[PDB]
């Protein structure tokens, strides 16, 4: 028989209202004979009707993959609106439903702080500087780094990763030609977060 | 359906000669109607015998988990030997292979770097160290934390994160009561991987 999965936004669609956070229902396992998939959606129990749906794929396996997305409203993921996928298809007794929200629990502000590149690493040609990100729940969150006012890109940023307590830290590694950080540039680590005041907060990191 | 989960084993395992490395094949989701699970294991399409497959546990959800564990050679693991578990099982169409390997292309050292606590984090009563490990490949790696002759426990580590030029970093992080660090105790980060000479180096940290 069919069987349903339903999948949340990127966490980085939820924090940019240039974006558009989707939740995604997808029904595996439906079967040639009975290949039509009826989808409702309900937002807090009530339903709503602007749900995308998309042309089924088969599978190699010769099952179709099915798929529906919703379009959610950035405040109503924050504010832990509930949403539920209901499938209905032929091939089952009865309709599937799958529910998701936002992690529940009290949203904790990240601290932020900014690390110089070690003294052994000065042998090198190129430096690293670190920005710790860490205490904040839940764990969907974004680090950009800056110069100048303008972005800088040569960074990699750790997934978050569970603490003691119960919160979640990562680490983001800005790479620059070492002669920018002997020449006292300064530089910024960004980070934005549903619990952080206008969700936005920043630190520098400068030689001295 | 049931499903097939295939483990390597531990990069200490491996990186010393007097351990047992291991491959471990997990099958979740086997059902009280079709309870028989039948492993077949190869190195490089050679069928092998001396896996150790364990008792069946019943789980919670009213599933079985079963275990197949694989003894394997050091010399067989880093000459890139490929192991493949087969799954048998009444409920699957088919049987189901998983191939575990160590990953190939030609070693690279890391760099270890030990950083103090930033200094607005000298505020809280818990500090930070920070030990980065960069420029490694392939990514299997083990680290720890020691003071004063005996092992740290209060410590997290990210996962392995691909850098630009196709090595690995990470960053482990080791929580420590800030007096312990004011009163000047040695902390050092060990780091195990197979390019580092004899498989081990240490890097150590004190209030400067
Ligand atoms: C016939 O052959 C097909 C071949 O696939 C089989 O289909 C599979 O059936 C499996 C179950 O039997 C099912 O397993 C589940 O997988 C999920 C995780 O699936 C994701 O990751 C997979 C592997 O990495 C992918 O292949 C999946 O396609 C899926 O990828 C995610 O898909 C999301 C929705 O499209 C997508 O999110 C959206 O992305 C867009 C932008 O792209 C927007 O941002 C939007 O906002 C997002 O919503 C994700 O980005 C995407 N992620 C990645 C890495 O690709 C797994 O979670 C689940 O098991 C878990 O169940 C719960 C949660 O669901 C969890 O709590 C449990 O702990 C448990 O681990 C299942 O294992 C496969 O997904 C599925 N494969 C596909 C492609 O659908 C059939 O089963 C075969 N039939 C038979 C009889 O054999
Ligand atoms: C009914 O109930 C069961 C039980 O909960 C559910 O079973 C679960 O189904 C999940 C999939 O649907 C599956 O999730 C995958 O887990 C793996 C990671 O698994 C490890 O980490 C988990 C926690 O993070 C643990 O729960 C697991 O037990 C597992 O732990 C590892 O186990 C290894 C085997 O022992 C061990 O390695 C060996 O360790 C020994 C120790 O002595 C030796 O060192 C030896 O040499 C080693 O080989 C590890 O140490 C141990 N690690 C830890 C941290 O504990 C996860 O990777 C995977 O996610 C992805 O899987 C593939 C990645 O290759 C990917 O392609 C997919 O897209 C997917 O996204 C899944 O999350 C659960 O593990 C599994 N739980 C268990 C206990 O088996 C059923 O699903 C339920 N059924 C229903 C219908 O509800």
Request: aromatic residues 10%.
């Amino acid at each position: 028989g069919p069987s349903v999965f339903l999948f949340p936004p990127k966490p980085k669609d939820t924090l940019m209202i240039s974006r558009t956070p989707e939740v995604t229902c997808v029904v595996v396992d439906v079967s040639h004979e009975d290949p039509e998939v009826k989808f409702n959606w309900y937002v807090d129990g009530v339903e709503v009707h602007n749900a995308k749906t998309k042309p089924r794929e088969e599978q190699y396996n010769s099952t179709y993959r099915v798929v529906s997305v919703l379009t959610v409203l950035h405040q109503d993921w924050l504010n832990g609106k509930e949403y539920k996928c209901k499938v209905s298809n032929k091939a089952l007794p009865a309709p599937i439903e799958k529910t998701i929200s936002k992690a529940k629990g009290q949203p904790r502000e990240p601290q932020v702080y900014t690390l110089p590149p070690s003294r052994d690493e000065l042998t090198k040609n190129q430096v690293s500087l670190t920005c710790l990100v860490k205490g904040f729940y839940p764990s969907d969150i974004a680090v950009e780094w800056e110069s100048n006012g303008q972005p800088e890109n040569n960074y990699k940023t750790t997934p978050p990763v569970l603490d003691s307590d119960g919160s979640f830290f990562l680490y983001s590694k800005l790479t620059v030609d070492k002669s920018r950080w002997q020449q006292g540039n300064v530089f910024s680590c960004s980070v934005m977060h549903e619990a952080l005041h206008n969700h936005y907060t920043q630190k520098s990191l400068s030689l001295s």
